[PDB]
């Protein structure tokens, strides 16, 4: 059940840019990326725009708020810096990360960023912006083209390229095989589960669980509890018309959702009360739905 | 850092009794046993207490909640039956009881048997019935190892008693594993690949020696839920002392040595390994039993 409250739209544009989504941490504000590399604050109560920041050169590709509020991480398509961190509490550049193309949090305390450039992981120290740890193993590499680097819900391990390596010994552990040419992976938030594309596979023993079909070539984002899986299919617009919703616990789908227009990005807020999706509502004239959760 | 979160007695008892712990199902709820045999719920976070109920008539010693809510397991130190199998689902009520097991567990990857260990002796039972399937004793393997602890391996295939390896389906000991200590019989490894019996870690393919680790030694050794971490406390009443020791589970390279200067009862993490309880009395030695549960971030 996903009923359609409102739209976000680029006040004083022909046609709306929106390329990402994601709510602040305490939600009050809708934070937009733009294929321009504006970040534009939405008042998700209001629908009004309250601040538009240069934040990169191209289209915004990728936003995470920090759970305590504070911080920002950003990046963009093409040029550089290609990722940055900002300081939220005066809005200001607090470090770049020039060559990564995709940065996260740590996840347990989020004082780490992780950094993808190509087949290779990157983590920084938000403190100084240091360069702590290179994570590439020449001998196990997938080459996955949409490969993005990510830690466990612990922060000892980092899945990159289809390889778990530990934190602590910066050492591989283990290479899962290579089923596709994109999707690279991520940690289940139970922490037992490494999904990659259609596989599921133990965290612990590397066997293979579960072949869940309905996840080819999907972005995977969970809601904060952890109990639904949602799957937008890669095709520009990265994505198409509909996401479908899984339960996290067995991967059985619970709704396929046709939006009838072609998906750019979609977030949840903490509370799991909203979902925000960007629609091209052209043939980019790309808008951002709210849905209620339900 | 274990950055200290709450501290909690048992709620309006002169003497706090906690014995042992286990996380809930349910995210911020601990069950803990009792001295006096009772098992309680208790907020982990505000440290008040939530449910009681009558399990034995001695010191609860372990408890296991299964994974999906419906079922724990508990021993005690000198009641009769020594082991017992309660039901949550309604009503708190005993299923089964295992009569002369003084520790019992649940099978790994599906949890519909008990492991329950009398001195050398393994016994399997089924949850369903309570019929004891297999006795697992092999005179001319056995190691008679002080605090033999039966476990099954992650995928149930093999049960590791008294440093022997067992093949369930086939109940024949396929390996004795030489005997290095008199107290500590070893578990699996969660990767299914390696068997950790004290100091020494073994390959279960080749049986070979991979590692010799002697921080180990006398070790009561758990992983966390990830298989991240293996936390390991040290037998010196308590069976353990002040200190427990945390290794990396891929290099078994030391992490912390934790002394709280009081002697530990039992420690285990959430499901979600974010936190550490651990049970310790408040002088060393002490003979008043007066324990609190400490709470850690990790
Ligand atoms: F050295 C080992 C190796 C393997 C397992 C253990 N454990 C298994 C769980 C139970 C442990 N024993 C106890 C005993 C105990 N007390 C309660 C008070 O009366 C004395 C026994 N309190 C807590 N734990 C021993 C010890």
């Not at 912006?129 to 000892?156: E, I, M, S, W």
């Not at 799957?231 to 899984?246: C, D, E, H, N, V």
Request: net charge negative; hydrophobic share 35%.
């Amino acid at each position: 059940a996903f009923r359609p409250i409102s739209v976000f739209r680029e006040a004083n544009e022909d046609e709306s840019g929106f390329t990402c989504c994601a709510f602040s941490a305490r939600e009050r504000f809708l934070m937009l990326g733009t294929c321009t590399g504006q970040l534009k604050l939405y008042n998700v109560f209001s629908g009004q725009e309250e601040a538009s920041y240069n934040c990169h050169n191209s289209a915004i590709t990728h936003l995470e708020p920090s759970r305590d509020g504070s911080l920002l991480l950003t990046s963009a398509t093409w040029s550089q810096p290609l990722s940055a961190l900002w300081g939220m509490k005066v809005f200001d550049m607090k470090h770049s990360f020039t060559e990564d193309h995709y940065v996260e949090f740590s996840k347990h305390s989020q004082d780490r960023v992780i950094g993808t450039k190509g087949d290779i992981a990157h983590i920084y120290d938000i403190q100084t912006g240091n360069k702590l740890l290179t994570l590439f193993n020449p001998d196990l590499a997938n080459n996955y083209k949409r490969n993005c680097a990510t830690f466990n819900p612990t922060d000892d391990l980092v899945l990159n390229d289809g390889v778990l390596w530990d934190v602590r010994s910066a050492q591989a552990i283990h290479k899962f095989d290579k089923f596709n040419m994109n999707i690279s992976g991520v940690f289940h938030p139970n922490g037992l589960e490494v999904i990659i594309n259609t596989e599921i596979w133990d965290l612990r023993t590397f066997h293979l669980l579960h072949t869940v079909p309905a996840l080819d070539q999907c972005r995977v984002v969970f809601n904060h509890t952890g109990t639904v899986m949602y799957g937008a299919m890669l095709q520009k617009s990265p994505f198409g018309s509909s996401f479908r919703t899984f339960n996290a616990t067995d991967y059985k789908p619970i709704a396929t959702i046709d939006v009838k227009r072609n998906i750019f990005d979609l977030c949840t807020d903490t509370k799991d009360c909203y979902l925000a999706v960007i629609e091209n509502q052209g043939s980019m004239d790309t808008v951002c739905r709210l849905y209620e959760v339900g």
